[PDB]
Design a protein around this ligand. Structure first.
Ligand SMILES: *CC[C@H](OP(*)(=O)O)[C@H](O)COP(=O)(O)O
Ligand code: NA
Ligand code: NA
Ligand code: NA
Ligand code: NA
Length: 315
DNA sequence: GTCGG
DNA sequence: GCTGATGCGC
DNA sequence: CCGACGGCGCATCAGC
């Protein structure tokens, strides 16, 4: 919008770092720079101005000056026209193809979705499924559809055992109007520090779950589809969490990221440490004590004298 | 790439 | 066969 | 100057 050229430039740079250079820390630096500039409510006039924002340093400032002066970045123009770099970058759009698989494919002349179709022998299961649903997996999921999906999974987990607790988390639980995927956290009173299998099996039985990317005892990653134009196929994760770790898990997997940083910060200065699993009292010498009993995500907040924030208000 | 000890 | 490392997604 | 930057759960690879 105001700085869309800058934010587009930093996201392209991020993708190049992640996918081609395999520099995950440069990827995360450009993304951080991109999101603080996305939030700046003025049209940036100089790199010097942008540098004042946290996450923008000397190099992104220089890049912004080149972009504003010339309307482009020489290096990105060059990366963009590079056949090998552009193809490596592009293949990572397939779920299961990371930077390592995308380079391997481009090294053996496999550059396009069309090339992948004709070399399905050289793809693993995840990559094949990623290829099958390439377009569906880049579609966002309207909230209305997420509610129908939630309807089915809460109905079917209650059918296999009414003692299961299932919470859909992620952007969905923060009231977001569209979602990347569906992340379901499941727990059962029998589980504390075959329960997942029976839920996945029931969801396949009623043809909600259509494919499996990965499954073990505590994490399912797969594909689902709303019953019927056919709805797109969607990514669903299901995490089975110890009941005594559940509400910490729900808080962790709801976010947002910046919200949980600020929540970690507070708990620290109040003599408590929160992670994904437990909240723990902090001794006078900084030694974590025993995990504190947690019965609701409100409990966690109570332990650290914060006022409950509604998932709606946590973005 | 940016931050901070 | 196994154990540990690596790739991957989130 | 230089190390941190999230790290878990699963699939598959590398080595024994
Ligand atoms: C944006 C400029 C780069 O910052 P980073 O340490 O990735 C470098 O200064 C120039 O190197 P290159 O763009 O990676 O060749
Ligand atoms: Na800055
Ligand atoms: Na990918
Ligand atoms: Na690569
Ligand atoms: Na859907």
């Amino acid at each position: 919008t105001l700085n869309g050229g800058i934010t587009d430039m930093l996201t392209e740079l991020a993708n190049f770092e992640k996918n081609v250079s395999q520099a995950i820390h440069k990827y995360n630096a450009y993304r951080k720079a991109a999101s603080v500039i996305a939030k700046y409510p003025h049209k940036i006039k100089s790199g010097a101005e942008a540098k004042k924002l946290p996450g923008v340093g000397t190099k992104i400032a220089e890049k912004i000056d080149e972009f504003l002066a010339t309307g482009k970045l020489r290096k990105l123009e060059k990366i963009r026209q590079d056949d090998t770099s552009s193809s490596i970058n592009f293949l990572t759009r397939v779920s299961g193809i990371g930077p390592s698989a995308a380079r391997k494919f481009v090294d053996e002349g496999i550059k396009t979705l069309e090339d992948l179709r004709k070399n399905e022998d050289k793809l693993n299961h995840h990559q094949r499924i990623g290829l099958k649903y390439f377009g569906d997996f880049e579609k966002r999921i309207p909230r209305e559809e997420m509610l129908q999906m939630q309807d089915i999974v809460l109905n079917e987990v209650k059918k296999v055992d009414s003692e299961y607790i299932a919470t859909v988390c992620g952007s969905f639980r923060r009231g977001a109007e569209s979602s990347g995927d569906m992340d379901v956290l499941l727990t059962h009173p029998s589980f504390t520090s075959k329960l997942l299998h029976q839920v996945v099996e029931q969801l396949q039985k009623v043809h909600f779950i259509t494919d499996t990317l990965s499954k073990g005892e505590t994490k399912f990653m797969g594909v689902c589809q709303l019953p019927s134009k056919e709805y797109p196929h969607r990514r669903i994760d299901i995490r089975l969490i110890p009941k005594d770790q559940y509400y910490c898990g729900v808080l962790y997997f709801t976010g947002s990221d910046i919200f949980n940083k600020n929540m970690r910060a507070h708990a620290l200065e109040k003599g408590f440490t929160i992670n994904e699993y437990t909240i723990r009292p902090l001794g006078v010498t900084g030694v974590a004590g025993e995990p504190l009993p947690v019965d609701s995500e409100k409990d966690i907040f109570d332990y650290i004298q914060w006022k409950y924030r509604e998932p709606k208000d946590r973005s």
